[PDB]
Amino acid sequence: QVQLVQSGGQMKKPGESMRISCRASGYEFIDCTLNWIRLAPGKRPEWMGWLKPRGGAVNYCRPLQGRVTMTRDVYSDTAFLELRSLTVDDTAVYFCTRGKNCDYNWDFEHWGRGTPVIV
Amino acid sequence: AGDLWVTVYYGVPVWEDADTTLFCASDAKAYSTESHNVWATHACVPT
Ligand SMILES: *[C@@H]1O[C@H](CO)[C@@H](O[C@@H]2O[C@H](CO)[C@@H](O[C@@H]3O[C@H](CO[C@H]4O[C@H](CO[C@H]5O[C@H](CO)[C@@H](O)[C@H](O)[C@@H]5O[C@H]5O[C@H](CO)[C@@H](O)[C@H](O)[C@@H]5O)[C@@H](O)[C@H](O[C@H]5O[C@H](CO)[C@@H](O)[C@H](O)[C@@H]5O[C@H]5O[C@H](CO)[C@@H](O)[C@H](O)[C@@H]5O)[C@@H]4O)[C@@H](O)[C@H](O[C@H]4O[C@H](CO)[C@@H](O)[C@H](O)[C@@H]4O)[C@@H]3O)[C@H](O)[C@H]2NC(C)=O)[C@H](O)[C@H]1NC(C)=O
């Protein structure tokens, strides 16, 4: 089976930045697309953008266009996400997520263990 | 002007001892393509 081990959830303050990693295993890191879906209190699970680790191709969600920055070290098979200009509202638990197969990104069978950031 | 003749049969159930090249067939149960085996390679035909 595949698994996505993640970073520890840091404690932050508004008007700052955060960076949370996500290491993948059990599959070819390049062949499949990875997402970042955070979950805040009560709101629908918010998808922020997918990352295709071939050539770092990305597609960010409209409200996050400007703050979000999804990268990856294809060598350490690690997925990175930076989020500047922090808010108490964008506070959430973060989950790196790849689909069922590489033919379809949106069936998220594989989730990573939640990383809890506090703002 | 005879009685018996040579008659030829194809598919006759006979064998002789022999040495030949033998190829490999694997059980194909190795799911992980990443972690591939040194003996049960991809060239092994499926069982
Ligand atoms: C293809 O071609 C494309 C187009 O050419 C390329 O696209 C470009 O890509 C680059 C990225 O590679 C992108 O760059 C941006 O860079 C920003 C960094 O700049 C900031 O800092 C500088 C430096 O200021 C400090 O240093 C100087 C001296 O060096 C000093 O004079 C300053 O006072 C200041 O010093 C301070 O500190 C010292 C410490 O000692 C003190 O002593 C001192 O007293 C000071 O306190 C600033 O100059 C910048 O300011 C600009 O941007 C701000 C943003 O609000 C403006 O307010 C500011 O007026 C100025 O904007 C100018 O340009 C605009 C547009 O023309 C004018 O309207 C305006 O009037 C000014 O003339 C920066 O503060 C970086 O921060 C930035 O990212 C941020 O901004 C974007 C929006 O722009 C946000 O969305 C982000 O979220 C970030 O907040 C960005 O990365 C270029 O902008 C981009 N080009 C365009 C047109 O967009 C492309 O790369 C190329 N190649 C490919 C492959 O595509």
Side-chain angles (χ1 to χ4, degrees):
Chain A
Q1 203 78 72
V2 311
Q3 262 196 17
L4 313 161
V5 63
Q6 297 191 237
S7 59
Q10 309 134 79
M11 185 180 301
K12 293 284 179 286
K13 182 187 185 302
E16 299 171 0
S17 305
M18 58 89 80
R19 202 165 177 268
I20 29 92
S21 44
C22 168
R23 199 178 205 182
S25 178
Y27 79 97
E28 183 48 89
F29 185 63
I30 295 91
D31 289 352
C32 247
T33 303
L34 268 162
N35 301 25
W36 283 104
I37 295 166
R38 84 186 185 200
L39 288 97
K43 308 173 79 174
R44 310 189 193 189
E46 187 175 322
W47 170 83
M48 296 164 56
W50 55 246
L51 165 61
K52 297 173 183 172
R54 191 103 53 193
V58 282
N59 187 46
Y60 309 131
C61 186
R62 316 306 265 285
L64 299 117
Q65 291 184 356
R67 302 133 72 174
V68 72
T69 301
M70 299 169 185
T71 94
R72 52 92 187 80
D73 190 356
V74 78
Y75 299 140
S76 68
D77 305 325
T78 309
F80 289 114
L81 175 45
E82 161 254 60
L83 194 62
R84 50 170 284 104
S85 308
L86 277 168
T87 320
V88 299
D89 292 81
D90 63 27
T91 315
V93 191
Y94 288 75
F95 300 75
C96 58
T97 335
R98 104 152 180 79
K100 260 206 75 74
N101 52 79
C102 298
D103 247 326
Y104 200 67
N105 172 247
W106 304 115
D107 289 332
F108 307 87
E109 183 169 350
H110 303 125
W111 294 65
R113 176 62 70 177
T115 291
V117 306
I118 320 98
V119 178
Chain B
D3 195 51
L4 251 53
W5 297 267
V6 168
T7 297
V8 202
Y9 295 75
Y10 192 54
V12 138
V14 180
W15 65 87
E16 53 196 62
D17 293 349
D19 298 335
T20 189
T21 41
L22 303 118
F23 62 94
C24 149
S26 62
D27 291 287
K29 300 309 294 183
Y31 155 75
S32 290
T33 319
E34 282 221 276
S35 303
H36 36 252
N37 198 272
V38 304
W39 299 298
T41 75
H42 310 262
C44 282
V45 300
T47 188

Tab-separated table of all heavy atoms in Angstrom, chain A residues 26-28, chain B residues 31-32 34:
chain	number	residue	atom	x	y	z
A	26	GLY	N	5.584	3.981	-1.758
A	26	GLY	CA	4.799	2.881	-2.287
A	26	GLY	C	4.398	3.033	-3.741
A	26	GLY	O	3.843	2.107	-4.334
A	27	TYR	N	4.671	4.200	-4.318
A	27	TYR	CA	4.343	4.447	-5.714
A	27	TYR	C	5.358	5.398	-6.328
A	27	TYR	O	6.098	6.077	-5.618
A	27	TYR	CB	2.922	5.010	-5.851
A	27	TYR	CG	2.799	6.489	-5.543
A	27	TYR	CD1	2.812	7.433	-6.561
A	27	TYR	CD2	2.660	6.937	-4.238
A	27	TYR	CE1	2.703	8.779	-6.290
A	27	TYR	CE2	2.546	8.286	-3.955
A	27	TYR	CZ	2.569	9.202	-4.986
A	27	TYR	OH	2.456	10.547	-4.717
A	28	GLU	N	5.397	5.439	-7.655
A	28	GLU	CA	6.307	6.339	-8.340
A	28	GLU	C	5.816	7.767	-8.183
A	28	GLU	O	4.807	8.158	-8.771
A	28	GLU	CB	6.449	5.983	-9.818
A	28	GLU	CG	7.444	6.868	-10.546
A	28	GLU	CD	8.758	7.008	-9.797
A	28	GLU	OE1	9.660	6.173	-10.015
A	28	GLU	OE2	8.887	7.948	-8.982
B	31	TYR	N	2.444	-7.528	-6.932
B	31	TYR	CA	1.721	-6.306	-7.274
B	31	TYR	C	2.677	-5.151	-7.540
B	31	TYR	O	2.647	-4.545	-8.612
B	31	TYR	CB	0.736	-5.919	-6.161
B	31	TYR	CG	0.403	-4.438	-6.134
B	31	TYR	CD1	-0.446	-3.877	-7.082
B	31	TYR	CD2	0.943	-3.599	-5.164
B	31	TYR	CE1	-0.746	-2.524	-7.066
B	31	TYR	CE2	0.648	-2.244	-5.141
B	31	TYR	CZ	-0.197	-1.713	-6.095
B	31	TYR	OH	-0.496	-0.369	-6.080
B	32	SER	N	3.525	-4.855	-6.558
B	32	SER	CA	4.425	-3.711	-6.634
B	32	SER	C	5.383	-3.842	-7.813
B	32	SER	O	6.176	-4.779	-7.887
B	32	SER	CB	5.213	-3.550	-5.329
B	32	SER	OG	4.377	-3.114	-4.268
B	34	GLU	N	7.352	-1.227	-8.550
B	34	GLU	CA	8.508	-0.531	-8.004
B	34	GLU	C	9.510	-1.518	-7.416
B	34	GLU	O	10.649	-1.604	-7.874
B	34	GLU	CB	8.075	0.475	-6.938
B	34	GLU	CG	7.492	1.764	-7.491
B	34	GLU	CD	7.962	2.983	-6.724
B	34	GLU	OE1	7.360	3.300	-5.678
B	34	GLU	OE2	8.945	3.618	-7.163
